[PDB]
Design a protein around this ligand. Structure first.
Ligand SMILES: Cn1ccc(NCc2ccccc2)n1
Ligand SMILES: [Zn+2]
Length: 139
């Protein structure tokens, strides 16, 4: 679990979105596994605006942060999970690293701020859902 809190927005994995998130829907994209919901308390988080391919993610299954090299956001085939059938996830970045389903919501961050959130895994790669392209989160 976990989310990004920036201005009056809450960013979560779409598949982990609560009733409250959907009642306060701002934007969702199923192919990205993201949902943004409106918040009544302001958010302090800084979103990275950059094309960094290095940083650090939180791994709740290890209670520890890991430094990684990651791919640029892309269209990667992702196997069926429970929450989705097999489909092309968009804006996905991969790193060689440990993750399990409950690690979703873990933040990936670089020196510029939040890059994205853990979204999928398998075969020893962690996938993160990129948020740096959503310039509207910083208004
Ligand atoms: C973020 N994330 C989703 C799946 C995953 N790792 C693959 C996996 C699936 C089920 C049990 C154990 C490991 N990491
Ligand atoms: Zn950066």
């Amino acid at each position: 679990s976990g989310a990004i809190y920036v201005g009056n927005y809450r960013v979560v994995n779409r598949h982990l979105a609560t009733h409250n998130d959907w009642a306060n829907l701002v934007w969702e994209d199923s192919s990205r596994d993201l949902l943004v919901s409106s918040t009544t308390a302001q958010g302090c988080d800084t979103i990275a605006r950059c094309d960094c391919q290095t940083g650090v993610y939180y791994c709740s299954s290890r209670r520890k942060h890991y430094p990684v090299s990651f791919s640029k956001p892309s269209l990667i085939f992702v196997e069926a999970s429970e929450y989705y059938p097999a489909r092309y996830q968009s804006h996905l970045m991969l790193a060689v690293g440990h993750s399990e389903p409950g690690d979703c919501g873990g933040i990936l961050r670089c020196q510029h701020g939040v890059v994205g959130i853990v979204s999928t895994g398998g075969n020893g790669l962690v996938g993160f859902a990129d948020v740096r392209d959503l310039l509207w989160l910083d208004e």
